[PDB]
Amino acid sequence: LVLYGAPYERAVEVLEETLRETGARYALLIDRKGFVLAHKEALWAPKPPPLDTLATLVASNAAATQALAKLLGEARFQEEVHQGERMGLYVDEAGEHALLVLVFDETAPLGKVKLHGKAAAAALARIAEEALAN
Template identity: 60%
Template sequence: MIEPSLALYGDAYARVDAHIQDLLDVTGVRYGLLVDRKGFVLSHKEALWAPRPPALDSVATLVASNAAATAALANMLGEHTFSEQIHQGENGTLYVESVGDQALLTLIFDASVPLGKVKVYARKTVVQLAAILDELKDIPEIQLGGDFSAGATALLDDLLG
């Protein structure tokens, strides 16, 4: 089973959420997502006035897939990476910017929001998010021993009969 490449929880999750919310508040973006490179939504926020969001899991999967394809294109053209992607339609824009090698900041907004403003504030937010994600690299992975499994099984047996 494929699992997210990052475990975002507790204080780190709250700080990421706060930075994304600040970005939405200052720019007028409808939806902000932090997506890992495997296509999992790590965090998401939406503006209070935003209409019903698209299927965020599907957006995340497609954004991660597109980022992988774009990375291959960058490599073919002699670039290390392309750090941002912009998809503009008549009524809406999808803006994706890399947060280091670990995640993608994905913003969805309508034509009333200036792209330049989004790019300026998104870059500031990316720096903040990257710092939080870098902190998580130093946290050791939780190791659950065999006695945890046996204890959990016993508790479930007692609970469910």
């Protein structure tokens, strides 16, 4: 589902708030398939590596987790934190039709993001349903 206009800014805005709230580089909402809906960044941050890719990788990574989810007694997982030695990337669903992906570094706590992800998902999924209905 594509985003545009007012409830797009709305989806834009929420990303902006988390950036303050998590002191980290790039937050990005995307539909499940892999097409970037939006992408908002930190003023204090360097240029963002081909985000056009990033997300479609996480969506390419989507049914890479879920497919395993069977044995584990579940349809799919949502929340997942992938930290590297220096920097780490956040991974989560924003509805049944949207994946939020944030990026974070050292200048953020493994805890302060987890917290400004999932709530914000619940904020952006509300936005999702509104972008497909009415």
